[PDB]
């Protein structure tokens, strides 16, 4: 598939819709949408491994990481496939996302369809925190909203 979409919901007020497009195989993924109800500022933003939301965002498992690498930012070379860095929420709690990534994909081994996209309570430190959790999660904190990534029309 070349188009995907995701509805993010969670415990609190955070919600949104994110779209995906890679218009040619193994090319760059354009991710765009907007998320409301966030605290003004930066929030971690990754694709987690499982699209199981039976137990909320908890059952999504960890960052999508087929290469068994440490946590990093999206520009970094040492990275999880699912590391998409941060989204920034404005003074009304709205974060308009428009991002390009080329390590995620809508087909092949690093396909993200059927997995879970997650917005986080705190900013992702992109692996540079200086502790061990920073190399796992970016110290991004709890999962405010999430959804399974489906084939979109």
């Amino acid at each position, epitope marked *: 598939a070349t188009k995907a979409v995701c509805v993010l919901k969670g415990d*609190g*007020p*955070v*919600q949104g819709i994110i779209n995906f497009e890679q218009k040619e195989s193994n090319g760059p993924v354009k991710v765009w949408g907007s998320i*409301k*109800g*966030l*605290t*003004e500022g930066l929030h971690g933003f990754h694709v987690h491994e499982f699209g199981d939301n039976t137990a909320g965002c908890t059952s999504a498992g960890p960052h999508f990481n087929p290469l068994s690498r440490k946590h990093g930012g999206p520009k970094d070379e040492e990275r999880h496939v699912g590391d998409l860095g941060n989204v920034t*929420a*404005d*003074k*009304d*709690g709205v974060a308009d996302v428009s991002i390009e990534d080329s390590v995620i994909s809508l087909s092949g081994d690093h396909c993200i369809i059927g997995r879970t996209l997650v917005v986080h*309570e705190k900013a992702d430190d992109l692996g540079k925190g200086g502790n061990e959790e920073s190399t796992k999660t970016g110290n991004a904190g*709890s999962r*405010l909203a999430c959804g399974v990534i489906g084939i979109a029309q």
Partner: nanobody
Amino acid sequence: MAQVQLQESGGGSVQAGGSLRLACVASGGDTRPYITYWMGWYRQAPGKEREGVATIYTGGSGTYYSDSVEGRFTISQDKAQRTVYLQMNDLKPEDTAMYYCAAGNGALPPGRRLSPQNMDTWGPGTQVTVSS
């Protein structure tokens, strides 16, 4: 922290042209820090519908005002104390009303943030009377 509860204070009597500050203290409810609200100030004058005056996003800083009060009222918050202040200046006689605090969902979209029907919690009210 049962359910969210709002308490207004600071209403009184003032002559036209005067000032007033109202405060709305929030207590209880889900106290996790990412729980955001549009908080924020409504009026009901004799014989008229309840109307929104000002609102503020407790998870950030955006503020929005009704036309009738833009320029004269200002809304602010002390997030650590869950208090939202309405600084009312250049008061006119028609600002006389019972003033209510109200909390709405933090994901409220533009144009519902300051509408009474989309408010979830209301305070008891504090009366403001402005003399001609």
